[PDB]
C-alpha cells in the first residue's frame, strides 16, 4: 500500500532520469528489477548514477534557489555504506574539507543511508554543519538567535559554549537505536572564517564582524524516486546578501545596522535619511570585498540573477518547464534591479527535490 | 439576469456599509427601494454617504496598497452630475488643484457617472492625470517609455509634444456619443513639479532630474455594490521609492542609475561594487530630500511600512480580515528591513475595490 506509492514514484523517476541520461532503452529492465525488489524487500536501492543524477535534478527543481544554473556540476558523495557514528562524523568532516577546497568552494552533497520505514538510520540535529551558537538569558543576548534552541539542546548533552558571539556549535546527530545524539567539536583547522572589513572605511573592522565560509544545509530531506534521504547535507557558496542583508542585519539575527551606521559616519535618527538602506549597502559591499580578499568563493546578487537568467534560458532550450518561488528568488537588496522582480514564476513542486522535515528537539 | 448580479452585489454592499455606519436598521427599507429601482430602471443610484463610504472601503480593500492606514480620511468628490466635456475638464482641473493643496497633498477621488449598460458615460484615456510623454524613433528615446503609446495616440489627435524628457501630456478623454476623445493642455500653474537635488552632493543637480508632485491614477474602475465607476480618478502622495527606485531607475523607464553613479563619484564597472544599490540609495535619498525641501508631501518606505503595520493592527481590532499582495506591498528597496517582508498576506479580493480595465487605444 506504500509499496504502491514507492513504485509509482520510482517509475516516474527512472523514466525521466534514464531519458535525460540517454539510457531510455534500459528503463524497462531496470524497472522490472525494481518492481521485484520492492515486492520482496519493501524498497529498492539506487545505482550510483541514479543517486547522483537524482540529487542534481533535486537542486534543479528547487524553486527557491537562484543558484540553479550550476545544478549539473554538483559533486555527489555516496555514503550509503556508513553504519557507525565515527563513520558519520568522519563523513561530515570530509564533506566540510572537500566542499571548502581551500576557499574555492565546490558545491557538494554527501548522501547518507535513507529512511527505512520512515525510520531514520542517521538523524542530523544541526541546521547547518557550520553554524554559530546563540544564547539568551536575563535580557542578555549573545551569538545568533536563530541558534538559541539547538544551543540549549547541545548544552543538555554536556557541551558548553564559550559565549562569544561566534561560538562554533558542535556536530550533533543520533544513530538509529541510540536514545540520545552524540556531539563532536569541529576542528578549527577545517572551518574557514572571514573577518568582515570594508574596501575603504577602515573603522569598519571595529565592528569585529566575521562569518564562516561555507553554508552547508543539514536539515532537509532529499527525495528521489520515493526514497527518502533525510540525512543528505549539501552546500553551495554564499550569495553576499544572505550574510550582509539578513544574517548580520535582521533584528532577530545579529542586528548590526545601527552599529554599521555609526562606523560609516552617518546618523541613524531619521527614516527619511534612508540610513538603514545605506548601512545595508556598505555592509553588503564589505562582505563581498572580504570574501574576495580572503579568496573564498561568493557571488553578488546581480551576477547571481544573471546566472539565473541563463538558467531560465537553458531550461527553455531543453524543453523543461521552469518552476520558481518569486518571493524567495528576489534578493533582499535592490530586487527591482534584477530581471527576476519583473517577471513571475510558476511555484509548482516537481520531484526529485529537497524538503523541510521536523527537528527532533523543538 | 444581470439585474440579478447587481442586486446581490447591492445587498452585500448595503448591509456591510450601513453596518459600519451604525445604520443597520435602515438597511431593510433602503434595500426595498433599491430592489424596486433595479426592477424598473435596470440600475440604482447611491446616496452621497454610500458613495463616499464605498470609495473608502475600496481603498481599504486594495491588496497592493501600503498606504491604506488612511483609508477613512479619503476626500470624495461626487461628480455624477457632469454631462459635458467642459464640465469633465473643469472637474479634472479642480481635482488636480484641490488634491495638490499647495503641496500639502489631500488624498482625493473625483467620481464621474458610472457605466450604464457597460457603456461608459465618460472614458478617460490618461493613466495618470499628470504624466510625462514618451517618444521612440530611429533608436532615439526621449521622455517616459511607459507613455510611448498614449503619446502616439495624442499625436494622432493633433497634439504635438515639444520632445523634452518631461513634456506634460494633455488630459484626454471621450464622452459617450463622440467617436474621438478631446484633449486639453494642462495649465502649468496647476502642476507642481519637484527638481531633484541631493542633500550634500551638489553635482546631483547636473542630472537635471525632476518629477511631478501628485500621482493621480485615472485608469482604474471603482466598483461599489455592483455599480461600475469606470471614471473615478484618485490620488495619494508618493512613496519615495516609486519615483527613485522605479520611475527614474528602471531600464524601461528613465534608466538613470549609471548617470547617478557618475555624479556621486563612484565607478559603474563591477557588480561586486554594488554600484547599482548605492546609486539607488543616493537617488532615493535625493528624491525624499527634494520633496521635503519643496514642501510637497511624500513618505519614505520605512515610515510607510510602519503606518501599514498600524493598519494591520487596526484591522484586527475591528475584527476585519486583512488582505494584501506581498509581492506589491514589499518596497523595492531594502524590503527585508520592513516587517512586511517577514510575514505573509492573504491575497483574496474583497469588494468594494479598484480594478484594471482596458484602455481604448492599445
Ligand atoms: C552554488 C551556489 C549557490 C547559491 C549562491 C545559492 C543561493 C541560494 C539562495 C540565495 C537561496 C535562498 C536563501 C534565502 O533567500 O534566504 C537558496 C535557496 C535554496 N537553495 Fe541554493 N544556492 C546555491 C547552491 C545550492 C545547492 C548546491 C543546493 C542543493 C544541492 C541548493 C538548494 C537550495 C534550496 C533547497 C533552497 C531552499 C531552501 C529552503 O526552502 O529553505 N542550492 N539558494
Ligand atoms: C496617501 C498615500 C498613498 C500611498 C503612499 C500609497 C502607496 C501605494 C504604493 C506604493 C502602491 C504600489 C505601487 C507599486 O508598487 O508600484 C500602491 C498601490 C495602490 N494604491 Fe495606494 N497609496 C496611497 C493612497 C492611495 C489611495 C488614495 C488609493 C485609492 C483611493 C490607493 C489605491 C491603491 C491601489 C488600487 C493600488 C494598486 C494599483 C494597481 O493594482 O496597479 N492608494 N499604493
Ligand atoms: C530548512 N531550511 C534550511 C536552511 C537552514 C539554515 C539556513 C538556510 C536554510 O535554507 C536557505 C538556504 C538553503 C540552501 C542554500 C544553498 C546555498 C546558499 N548560498 N544558500 C542557501 C540557503
Ligand atoms: C492600472 N494601474 C494604475 C497605475 C497607473 C500609473 C501608475 C501606477 C498605477 O498603479 C500603481 C499605483 C496605484 C495607486 C497609487 C496611489 C498612491 C501612490 N503613491 N502610488 C500609487 C501607485
Ligand atoms: C507580475 C510580476 O510579479 C510583476 O513583475 C510585478 C512584481 N512586483 C511588483 N511590485 C511593485 N511594487 N510594482 C510593480 O510594478 C511590480 N511588478
Ligand atoms: C513566509 C514569508 O513569505 C517569509 O517572510 C519569507 C519571505 N521571503 C523570504 N525570502 C528569502 N529570500 N528568505 C526568507 O527567509 C524569506 N522569508
Ligand atoms: Cl546562512
Ligand atoms: Cl507613478
What's A61's domain CATH number? 3.90.340.10
Q: Is B65 a catalytic residue?
A: yes
Count of the separate structural domains present in chain B: 3
ω into B352 cis (within 30 of 0): yes
Burial (CB count within 10 angstroms: exposed 0-12, middle 13-18, buried 19+), residue A286: buried
Identify which of B54, B55, B73, B67 has the alpha carbon closest to the alpha carbon of residue B109.
B55
* Cβ neighbours of B303 in A, within 8 Å: 271-272
Partners of A195 in the beta sheet? A210
Q: Which of B58, B62, B302, B352 to mutate to test the pocket of ligand 2 (most atoms within 8 A of CB)?
A: B62
- For chain B, what is the radius of gyration of the CA atoms? 22
**Which of these is catalytic: B50, B237, B275, B282?**
B237
Q: What is the CATH number of the domain that holds A134?
A: 3.90.440.10
> Do A143 and A134 meet the contact criterion of CB atoms below 8 Å apart?
yes
Identify which of B207, B208, B211, B205 has the alpha carbon closest to the alpha carbon of residue B193.
B211
Residue B335, domain member (yes or no): no
Give me the sheet containing A182-184, strands edge to edge: A122-124, A171-175, A182-184
> Do B31 and B11 meet the contact criterion of CB atoms below 8 Å apart?
yes
> Do A198 and A34 meet the contact criterion of CB atoms below 8 Å apart?
no
Residue A75 sits in the same domain as residue A171: no
Residue A6, domain member (yes or no): yes
ω into A353 cis (within 30 of 0): no
Q: Which three cell numbers stand for residue B2?
A: 444581470
Map residue B183 onto helix, strand or coil: strand
Identify which of A3, A32, A20 has the alpha carbon closest to the alpha carbon of residue A319.
A20
Residue A8: phi and psi, rounded to 5, are -70, -40
Residue A23 and residue A20: Cα distance in Å, rounded?
Answer: 8
- CA torsion angle B323 B329 B335 B337 (round to 10): -50
Residue A285 and residue A204: Cα distance in Å, rounded?
Answer: 11
> How do strand A108-111 and strand A75-78 relate by DSSP bridges?
parallel
With a 6 Å cutoff on the Cβ, whether A326 touches ligand 6 is no
Residue B182, domain member (yes or no): yes
Residue B155 and residue B178: Cα distance in Å, rounded?
Answer: 18
Contacts of B239 (CB under 8 A, 6+ apart): B66, B67, B298, B299, B300, B301, B304, B331
DSSP state of A321: P
> Do A254 and A147 meet the contact criterion of CB atoms below 8 Å apart?
no
- CA torsion angle A78 A82 A88 A94 (round to 10): -40
Alpha helices in A106-174 (DSSP H): 148-154
Residue A113 sits in the same domain as residue A3: yes
**B352: left (phi > 0), else alpha (psi -120 to 50), else beta?**
beta
Residue B340, domain member (yes or no): no
Contacts of A245 (CB under 8 A, 6+ apart): A280, A283, A284, A331, A332, A333, B334, B336
Q: At what angle do helices A48-60 and A2-20 cross, to 10 degrees?
A: 90
Residue A284 and residue A304: Cα distance in Å, rounded?
Answer: 14
> Do A280 and B337 meet the contact criterion of CB atoms below 8 Å apart?
yes
Map residue A353 onto helix, strand or coil: strand
Residue A12: phi and psi, rounded to 5, are -55, -45
Q: What is the CATH number of the domain that holds A287?
A: 3.90.1230.10
Partners of B235 in the beta sheet? B108, B216
Q: How far is A270 from chain B (nearest CA, A)?
A: 10
Interface test with A, best of B258, B274, B304 (most A CBs within 10 A): B274
Contacts of B102 (CB under 8 A, 6+ apart): none
Distance, CA of B334 to chain centre = 23
CA torsion sign, B132 to B137 to B138 to B139?
positive
Identify which of A267, A263, A289 has the alpha carbon closest to the alpha carbon of residue A276.
A267
Identify which of A211, A249, A246, A213 has the alpha carbon closest to the alpha carbon of residue A331.
A246
Q: How far is B201 from chain A (nearest CA, A)?
A: 14
Map residue A86 onto helix, strand or coil: helix
Contacts of A86 (CB under 8 A, 6+ apart): none
Identify which of A353, A360, A354, A362 has the alpha carbon closest to the alpha carbon of residue A122.
A360
Residue B228: phi and psi, rounded to 5, are -110, 100
Residue A34 and residue A288: Cα distance in Å, rounded?
Answer: 48
> Do A117 and A228 meet the contact criterion of CB atoms below 8 Å apart?
no
Q: Is A65 annotated as a binding residue?
A: yes
Residue B146 and residue B125: Cα distance in Å, rounded?
Answer: 14
Give B79 Cα–ligand 5 centroid separation in angstroms: 32
Q: How far is B337 from chain A (nearest CA, A)?
A: 7
Q: Which three cell numbers stand for residue B23?
A: 445604520
Contact A281 B274 (CB under 8 A): yes
Q: Which three cell numbers stand for residue A30?
A: 531496470
Count of Cβ atoms closer than 10 Å to residue B195 Cβ: 13
Among A287, A303, A319, the domain-final residue is A303
Which residue of B249, B271, B277 is in closest CB contact with A281? B277
Contact A272 B300 (CB under 8 A): yes
Residue A56 sits in the same domain as residue A154: no
Identify which of B225, B223, B230 has the alpha carbon closest to the alpha carbon of residue B35.
B225
> Do A69 and A307 meet the contact criterion of CB atoms below 8 Å apart?
yes
> Do B253 and B247 meet the contact criterion of CB atoms below 8 Å apart?
yes
Residue B267 sits in the same domain as residue B210: yes
Residue A65 and residue A304: Cα distance in Å, rounded?
Answer: 10
> Do A216 and A189 meet the contact criterion of CB atoms below 8 Å apart?
no
Identify which of B319, B321, B339, B320 has the alpha carbon closest to the alpha carbon of residue B329.
B339
> Do B194 and B296 meet the contact criterion of CB atoms below 8 Å apart?
yes
> Do B323 and B25 meet the contact criterion of CB atoms below 8 Å apart?
no
Q: Which ligand ends up closest to the CA of A301?
A: 1
CA torsion sign, A10 to A12 to A13 to A16?
positive
Residue A76 sits in the same domain as residue A147: no
Which residue of A250, A274, A303 is in closest CB contact with B285? A274
Residue A174 sits in the same domain as residue A254: no
Residue B76 sits in the same domain as residue B99: no
Residue B219 and residue B357: Cα distance in Å, rounded?
Answer: 7
Q: Which three cell numbers stand for residue B353?
A: 475595490
Extended beta strands in A127-204, E state:
134-137, 140-143, 171-175, 182-184, 193-195
Q: Which three cell numbers stand for residue A78?
A: 555516496
Residue B24 and residue B13: Cα distance in Å, rounded?
Answer: 12
Contacts of B1 (CB under 8 A, 6+ apart): none
Contact B271 A303 (CB under 8 A): yes
Residue B268 sits in the same domain as residue B324: no
Which residue of A245, A271, A292 is in closest CB contact with B336? A245
Identify which of A295, A301, A293 has the alpha carbon closest to the alpha carbon of residue A339.
A301
Q: How far is B190 from chain A (nearest CA, A)?
A: 27
Alpha helices in B27-170 (DSSP H): 27-41, 48-60, 85-100, 148-154
Residue B268, domain member (yes or no): yes
Domain assignment of residue A271, given as a range? 193-215+238-303
> Do A27 and A18 meet the contact criterion of CB atoms below 8 Å apart?
yes
Contacts of B237 (CB under 8 A, 6+ apart): B105, B107, B214, B215, B296, B297, B298, B299
Burial (CB count within 10 angstroms: exposed 0-12, middle 13-18, buried 19+), residue B87: middle
Q: Is B68 a catalytic residue?
A: yes
Contact B302 A326 (CB under 8 A): no
Contacts of B94 (CB under 8 A, 6+ apart): B77, B110
**B123: left (phi > 0), else alpha (psi -120 to 50), else beta?**
beta
Burial (CB count within 10 angstroms: exposed 0-12, middle 13-18, buried 19+), residue B101: middle
> How do strand A216-217 and strand A234-235 relate by DSSP bridges?
antiparallel
Residue B196 and residue B95: Cα distance in Å, rounded?
Answer: 25
A127-B327-B198 Cα angle (round to 5) = 100
Output the residue whose Cα is nearest ligand 6's atom 9.
A328
* Cβ neighbours of A308 in B, within 8 Å: none
Map residue B316 onto helix, strand or coil: helix
Residue A50 sits in the same domain as residue A143: no
Distance, CA of B130 to chain centre = 11
Residue B338, domain member (yes or no): no
> How do strand A220-224 and strand B193-195 relate by DSSP bridges?
unpaired
Residue B39: phi and psi, rounded to 5, are -50, -60
Partners of B174 in the beta sheet? B123
Residue A60 sits in the same domain as residue A151: no
**Which of these is catalytic: A30, A68, A79, A174?**
A68
Identify the closest residue of chain A to B298 by CA–CA distance: A272
**Which of these is catalytic: A65, A79, A211, A223?**
A65
> Do A174 and A123 meet the contact criterion of CB atoms below 8 Å apart?
yes
Residue A46, domain member (yes or no): yes
Residue B129 and residue A213: Cα distance in Å, rounded?
Answer: 53
- For chain A, what is the radius of gyration of the CA atoms? 22
**Which of these is catalytic: B65, B71, B79, B125?**
B65
Q: Can you tell me which residue has the cell 494591520?
A: B312
Contact B334 A280 (CB under 8 A): yes
Residue A140 sits in the same domain as residue A97: yes
Give A64 Cα–ligand 1 centroid separation in angstroms: 7
Burial (CB count within 10 angstroms: exposed 0-12, middle 13-18, buried 19+), residue B19: exposed
With a 6 Å cutoff on the Cβ, whether B233 touches ligand 4 is no
* Cβ neighbours of A327 in B, within 8 Å: 326-327
Residue A156, domain member (yes or no): yes
Relative to the CA of B146, which ligand 4 atom is closest? Answer: 6
H/E element, B137? strand B134-137
Which residue of A281, A288, A326 is in closest CB contact with B272? A288
Q: Is B237 a catalytic residue?
A: yes
Residue B4 sits in the same domain as residue B30: yes
Contacts of A129 (CB under 8 A, 6+ apart): A92, A95, A96, A171, A216, A218, A233
Q: Is A163 a catalytic residue?
A: no
CA distances to A20, A293, B118, B119 from A9, in Å: 17, 46, 52, 55
Q: Which three cell numbers stand for residue B20?
A: 459600519
* Cβ neighbours of B300 in A, within 8 Å: 271-272, 274
With a 6 Å cutoff on the Cβ, whether B215 touches ligand 4 is yes
Contact A278 B272 (CB under 8 A): no
Give A243 Cα–ligand 7 centroid separation in angstroms: 7
Burial (CB count within 10 angstroms: exposed 0-12, middle 13-18, buried 19+), residue B31: middle
Quick one: resolution in A? Answer: 2.0
Q: Which three cell numbers stand for residue A124?
A: 542530523
Q: Which residues of A touch B (CB under 8 A)?
A: 245-246, 249-250, 257, 271-274, 276-278, 280-281, 284-285, 288-289, 292, 300, 302-303, 306, 326-327, 330, 332-337, 341
Helices and strands, number each (H, E), in chain A? 10, 16
Amino acid at each position: 500500500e506504500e509499496k504502491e506509492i514507492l513504485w509509482n514514484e520510482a517509475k516516474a523517476f527512472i523514466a525521466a532520469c534514464y531519458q535525460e541520461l540517454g539510457k531510455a532503452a534500459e528503463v524497462k529492465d531496470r524497472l522490472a528489477d525494481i518492481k521485484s525488489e520492492i515486492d520482496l524487500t519493501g524498497s529498492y536501492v539506487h545505482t550510483k548514477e541514479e543517486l547522483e543524477h537524482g540529487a542534481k535534478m533535486a537542486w534543479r527543481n528547487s524553486n527557491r534557489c537562484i543558484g540553479r544554473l550550476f545544478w549539473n556540476s554538483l559533486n555527489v558523495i555516496d555514503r550509503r555504506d556508513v553504519r557507525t557514528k565515527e563513520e558519520v562524523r568522519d563523513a561530515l568532516f570530509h564533506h566540510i574539507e572537500t566542499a571548502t577546497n581551500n576557499g574555492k568552494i565546490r558545491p557538494t552533497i554527501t548522501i547518507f543511508p535513507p529512511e527505512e520505514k520512515g525510520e531514520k538510520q542517521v538523524e542530523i540535529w544541526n541546521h547547518q554543519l557550520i553554524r554559530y551558537a546563540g544564547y539568551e538569558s536575563d535580557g542578555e543576548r549573545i551569538g545568533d538567535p536563530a541558534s538559541c534552541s539547538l544551543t540549549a539542546a547541545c548544552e543538555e548533552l554536556g557541551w558548553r559554549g564559550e559565549r562569544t558571539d561566534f561560538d562554533l556549535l558542535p556536530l550533533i546527530f543520533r544513530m538509529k537505536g541510540d536514545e540520545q545524539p552524540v556531539w563532536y567539536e569541529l576542528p578549527r583547522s577545517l572551518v574557514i572564517e572571514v573577518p568582515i572589513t570594508h574596501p575603504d572605511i577602515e573603522a569598519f573592522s571595529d565592528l569585529e564582524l566575521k562569518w564562516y565560509g561555507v553554508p552547508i544545509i543539514s536539515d532537509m530531506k532529499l527525495e528521489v524516486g520515493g526514497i527518502h534521504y533525510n540525512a543528505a547535507p549539501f552546500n553551495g557558496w554564499y550569495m553576499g546578501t544572505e550574510i550582509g542583508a539578513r544574517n548580520l542585519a535582521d533584528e532577530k539575527r545579529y542586528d548590526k545596522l545601527k552599529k554599521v551606521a555609526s562606523v560609516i559616519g552617518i546618523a541613524a535618527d531619521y527614516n527619511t535619511d534612508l540610513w538603514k538602506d545605506q548601512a545595508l549597502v556598505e555592509l553588503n559591499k564589505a562582505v563581498l570585498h572580504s570574501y574576495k580578499k580572503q579568496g573564498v568563493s561568493i557571488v553578488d546578487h546581480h551576477t547571481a540573477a544573471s546566472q539565473f537568467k541563463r538558467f531560465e534560458e537553458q531550461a527553455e532550450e531543453a524543453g523543461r518547464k521552469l518552476t520558481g518561488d518569486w518571493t524567495w528568488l528576489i534578493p533582499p537588496i535592490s530586487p527591482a534591479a534584477t530581471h527576476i522582480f519583473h517577471r513571475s514564476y510558476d511555484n509548482s513542486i516537481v520531484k526529485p527535490n529537497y524538503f523541510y522535515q521536523d527537528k527532533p528537539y523543538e
